[PDB]
Amino acid sequence: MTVAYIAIGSNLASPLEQVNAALKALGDIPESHILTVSSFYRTPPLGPQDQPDYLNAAVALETSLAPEELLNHTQRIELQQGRVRKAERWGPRTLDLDIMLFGNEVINTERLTVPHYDMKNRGFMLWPLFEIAPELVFPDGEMLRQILHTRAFDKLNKW
Ligand SMILES: Nc1ncnc2c1ncn2[C@@H]1O[C@H](COP(=O)(O)CP(=O)(O)OP(=O)(O)O)[C@@H](O)[C@H]1O
Ligand SMILES: Nc1nc2[nH]c(SCc3ccccc3F)nc2c(=O)[nH]1
Ligand SMILES: [Ca+2]
Ligand SMILES: [Ca+2]
Ligand SMILES: [Ca+2]
Ligand SMILES: [Ca+2]
Numbered sequence: 001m002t003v004a005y006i007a008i009g010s011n012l013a014s015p016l017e018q019v020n021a022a023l024k025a026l027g028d029i030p031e032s033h034i035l036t037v038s039s040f041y042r043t044p045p046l047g048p049q050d051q052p053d054y055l056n057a058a059v060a061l062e063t064s065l066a067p068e069e070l071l072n073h074t075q076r077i078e079l080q081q082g083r084v085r086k087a088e089r090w091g092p093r094t095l096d097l098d099i100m101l102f103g104n105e106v107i108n109t110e111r112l113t114v115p116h117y118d119m120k121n122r123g124f125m126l127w128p129l130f131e132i133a134p135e136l137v138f139p140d141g142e143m144l145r146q147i148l149h150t151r152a153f154d155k156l157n158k159w
């Protein structure tokens with residue numbers, strides 16, 4: 001088994017409802033168990049700002065799935081919760097499940113890049129991750145605690 005860390009975002013169609021439904025669906029992924037769920041955070045949108053605030057969270061998921069098999073399930077859950085692709089880049093969504101980390105693995109396949117390419121710059125990913133995994137070390141040896149100590153990220157507020 002490995003521990004994967006999944007970021008959750010939602011800013012459409014009742015985010016609290018979407019995220020609670022997603023937690024139930026994440027539990028039902030085969031070969032996998034949720035170990036830890038963060039608090040829920042209400043975060044202002046980054047990138048396009050003409051959209052509702054997000055509910056952001058993180059989950060630790062122990063799994064024996066292959067990384068792309070986990071992606072299959074997270075994409076299925078998003079689609080089953082009504083995620084619709086629109087042409088605008090980084091538009092609002094009912095549910096977004098990003099695989100932040102998959103153990104200490106560095107994955108670069110056609111469908112999957114892990115670590116998530118921008119997570120070290122996003123407080124809405126890092127703060128919920130630190131809540132559930134304060135001792136985390138990245139594949140490149142960087143410590144989560146050191147990033148959060150050193151870099152300016154705006155304060156997050158709970159939902
Ligand atoms: N670590 C990862 N987690 C989830 N999907 C990933 C991924 N690495 C690559 N992908 C790919 O990312 C594709 C596009 O996903 P989107 O959800 O539209 C990007 P987004 O989450 O809106 O922006 P972001 O990646 O800047 O956070 C997916 O279809 C999937 O194949
Ligand atoms: N708060 C919040 N803002 C978001 N913007 C996006 S689109 C990626 C993106 C694009 C540009 C800058 C930062 C980014 F993150 N996703 C979320 C989310 O989950 N939470
Ligand atoms: Ca399971
Ligand atoms: Ca827009
Ligand atoms: Ca995302
Ligand atoms: Ca995504």
Ligand SMILES: [Cl-]
Nearest residue numbers: 083084093094
């Ligand atoms: Cl959507």
Ligand SMILES: [Cl-]
Nearest residue numbers: 115138139140
């Ligand atoms: Cl890394």
Ligand code: NA
Nearest residue numbers: 138140141142
């Ligand atoms: Na580095």
